[PDB]
Design a protein around this ligand. Sequence first.
Ligand SMILES: [Mg+2]
Ligand SMILES: [Mg+2]
Ligand SMILES: [Mg+2]
Ligand SMILES: [Mg+2]
Ligand SMILES: [Mg+2]
Ligand SMILES: [Mg+2]
Ligand SMILES: [Mg+2]
Ligand SMILES: [Mg+2]
Ligand SMILES: [Mg+2]
Lengths: 119, 285, 92, 47
Amino acid sequence: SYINKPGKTSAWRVMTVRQQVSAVLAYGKIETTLKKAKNTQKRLDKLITLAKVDNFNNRRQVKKWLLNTNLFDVDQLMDHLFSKVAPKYEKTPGGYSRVLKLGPRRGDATEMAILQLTD
Amino acid sequence: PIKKIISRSNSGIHHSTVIDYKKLLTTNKNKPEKSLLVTLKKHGGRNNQGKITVRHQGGRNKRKYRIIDFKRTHYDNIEATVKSIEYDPNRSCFVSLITYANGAKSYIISPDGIKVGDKILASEHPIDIKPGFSMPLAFIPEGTQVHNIELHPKGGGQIARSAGSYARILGQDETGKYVILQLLSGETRKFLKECRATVGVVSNLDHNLVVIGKAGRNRHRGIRPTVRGSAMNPNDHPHGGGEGRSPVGRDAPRTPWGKRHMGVKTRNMKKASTNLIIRNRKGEQ
Amino acid sequence: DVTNVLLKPVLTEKVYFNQMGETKKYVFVVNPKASKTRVKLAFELVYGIKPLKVNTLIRKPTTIRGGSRFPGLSKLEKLAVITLPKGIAISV
Amino acid sequence: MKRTYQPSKLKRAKTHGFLARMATASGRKVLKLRRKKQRAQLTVSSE
RNA sequence: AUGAGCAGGUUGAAGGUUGAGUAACAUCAACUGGAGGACCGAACCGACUCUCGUUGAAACGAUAGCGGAUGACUUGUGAUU
RNA sequence: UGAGUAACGCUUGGGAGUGAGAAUCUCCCAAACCGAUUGACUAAGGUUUCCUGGACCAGGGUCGUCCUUCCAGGGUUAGUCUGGACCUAAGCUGAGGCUGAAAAGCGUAGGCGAUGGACAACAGGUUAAUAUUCCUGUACUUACAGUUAGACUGAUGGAGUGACAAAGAAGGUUUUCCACCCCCAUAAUUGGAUUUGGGGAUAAAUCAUAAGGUGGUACAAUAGGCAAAUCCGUUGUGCAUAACAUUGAGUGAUGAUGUCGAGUGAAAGUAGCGAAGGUGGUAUUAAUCAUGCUUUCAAGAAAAGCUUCUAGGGUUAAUCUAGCUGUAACCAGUACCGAGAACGAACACACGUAGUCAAGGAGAGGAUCCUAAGGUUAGCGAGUGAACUAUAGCCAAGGAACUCUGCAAAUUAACCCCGUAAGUUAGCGAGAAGGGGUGCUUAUGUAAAAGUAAGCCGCAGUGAAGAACGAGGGGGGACUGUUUAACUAAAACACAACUCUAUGCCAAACCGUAAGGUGAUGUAUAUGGGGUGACACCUGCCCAGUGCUGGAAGGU
Ligand SMILES: [Mg+2]
Ligand SMILES: [Mg+2]
Ligand SMILES: [Mg+2]
Ligand SMILES: [Mg+2]
Ligand SMILES: [Mg+2]
Ligand SMILES: [Mg+2]
Ligand SMILES: [Mg+2]
Ligand SMILES: [Mg+2]
Ligand SMILES: [Mg+2]
């Protein structure tokens, strides 16, 4: 066959990662597919760990990932992160998030999973 | 005269020519008089039934016919004057605008030689012989180039009115009517002595040597493509068929229809005009 | 002047919206062949107010009842709105 | 591609219309036959 | 029959004015002038090649290339054989 | 049965809500394509598909609370817009008439027939759905009477105008654009900023003003313009070098104490509020003046309408002109789609369909890459990342050995500067071949810029995208073109040019039974036919046979 959708290009994967990390920091919970959740978790953890020092280099490095959401805009989301989310976790070595499996979806029988983060 | 067209368009080479249209004519800028123009509807080789009867005829430009006084009969013994020598597209010759002294305009055929401000006349009695005049053939002396002739009296100028054409007088017959005319192309007819005529050959003598150079130029002039019979299939032409450049198999060449063609006599000799003939371009009667 | 050219009035939300203004544009449905001259003369001789301006439109027929085993065709009607001077208003 | 039925209602009416068919002998004959077979859509003048 | 359309950019003809030259022509140089079934190339038209599809998206096409592109051009509307 | 197999026909992530049920519906926020378009306006078509509320048998390649589906209710508003009531082209019809066994065919006067001509309206607002139509404000037109003043009107007919090609170029005036300036919000925690972001307009019509364009102008005779003529035409005379006639984009003033306006913003960014609403340059751009001009040859619509002309009439006043008051302005269309879902394709199909508006950066540009105004989620998903297939990318050394052939694929690629052969119809060949430079900063550059010198970085500097691979010999055809829609685009067909033949005008050839018509409103320097096929040089021999033309006594 010939004409075909662009599909899951690497840019699509990375941009989905960015959108989901923005969404999880903004609200604190995500209800997504499991096999996107296990892939979002890595970037989530790396950001929160990179964000405990608060120098301007860390602000630049985190600006490379976040996107604005309905709750917070990006320059509001950065402050919201570095003020309350990042320091809360400052003493935990790893393990900043959990992915728990929901029930299968009616549309596709995909394995819905919830991504969240608590102490 | 003729003038070349140096093209320098690098798609083939065509040594095209065109009549100069500048040293021959007056005010080449085209402003014909409005009173004497009627549009021509281009039938395009077609018919009132709409079928094709004359092949490869169509696609000419839009023209505007100039009403030409071939009859020269409503204005007699009355002087005129040539005003301009315009290029009327329909015929190969050059038409001239004359204005009769009462103030009445007309388009005629320009005998080769007359110029702006000349005087021309039309009558029924013996008059001078200068080019452009008109009078019955019995009065024109033998030997003068005569054009715009006509067959029946008071019938207007049918015969010998093309670019550079003429006809000579050759005395009279034995009857006392029927002045003889040596037409162009070797024939010799007997015209009635009541027929009018106009002296002087027709202008634009060099239309024979103008060379259409590109197929287009010819397409715009009204002649569409003509296809040889040997290209045809055996259907819709007698010369069709044959597996590759076969020749004209039938004993003589044939027309697109089934008629025998080459050099076969065709004139309807049971006609009134056969006894007004001395010779037929080759021999007697 | 048979006044058979005033078939019916139509009462819609649009008519009320336009009517509560100052010009007081009433509306009627008229004979499909009738014309604005006949309409305004009929209005003159049915109520008593010489009308200012008359407008006519026609609603071309369409398919009605859609798919119901016996599909049908709608009704061709000419709606004429009738305008009135500023300080006047009448009822049907 | 450009298919074989490009519609233009003036052409259709003038060609298969009722005043088209009621002007030649053959058209009168075809209207005779269609009244005989009792077509509800006698010509193309009616939708 | 009647209307519409051809982004953009080049080459710079014939002719003409001037100067030399000519016994006078012819010829040459500059300037003007702006032709051509001209040039390169989009819309537009056409359909040369591969690959794919060939119970297809499609009863003849797609991506990528491809020839013409002020002319024997292209096109709409109406009439006609 | 094949089989619950191939297919499901170009695209995402989430929050909140609804609901019994959600990937699929509503809202929000992003994200990803489009942007000479998937945007905006309409013609053609289609025929209610439009708007609101409701439903989820069937249709939707899945689902569905939802659909361009179904059900109930609703919407289309014109003196000026598209068309009739005006005009005609091709052409169609066609009284009498012509021809034809019959039907029918041809055709005159008349009549129809737009894709064209002529005809008067602009701006803004409003509703869920209409809008030059409704509303607000300001206008114009064509008729009708009645009235005031002036004037003799002057057509069913004559004349002028209407009324016209293609290409090219250069000017005028506003604009685009550039600069300045008034106004508005903005003043910033990530190191640094003393800015950053946006907007800057107002119409037809009336009055005056109009650079410039066109084309002599007055007077006198008149035999023509089916009669008539003071009009046109024709012929004389003077002024001439600008008068006169006619046309004219734009300018200013009214229109406008109005509407609109960046933004602000209550009960939805809606209602209402609503500041500036400008100066100069312009060696660039489009649009109008322009139905202008110039040139060339393939010689470039008709009629109605407008102005005029007399006839005809009118005076014991008709008719027209200018103004005032009043009256009327008819008939159909007007929604919506205008296509990767309403049209033509059997469909919610990768295809096709006339015209118009067409932003910004670099750029010659409507190319090319990214974005704006605005607009869409390509109506099956979620995974895994095996063979295998398509599509892209890449491949050391070698570089055509595979192969039917270098088919395909690859290299060059824009701009600027050098230089460019053989051959020839002396036009070309030629973008020939072959080479070099390209980025940023400073100073110089001219009026902007290209350029110039110095300096600096990188592996590389039209750093990405979009831009010719070339040389040499041969065959065919001269070339540009056309062709077998949907397997052949070629060496075939055409063509310019050549020759031969027929044809003397009621031409010959042709369609038709004939009428009629083309040829041709043509006339041998013209038209039909056969054959070859630019240009140069050549076109030898045979007239027994076939064919063609002529023959004059004979034979049948
Ligand atoms: Mg199987
Ligand atoms: Mg399988
Ligand atoms: Mg499958
Ligand atoms: Mg399409
Ligand atoms: Mg289109
Ligand atoms: Mg652009
Ligand atoms: Mg583009
Ligand atoms: Mg040949
Ligand atoms: Mg040959």
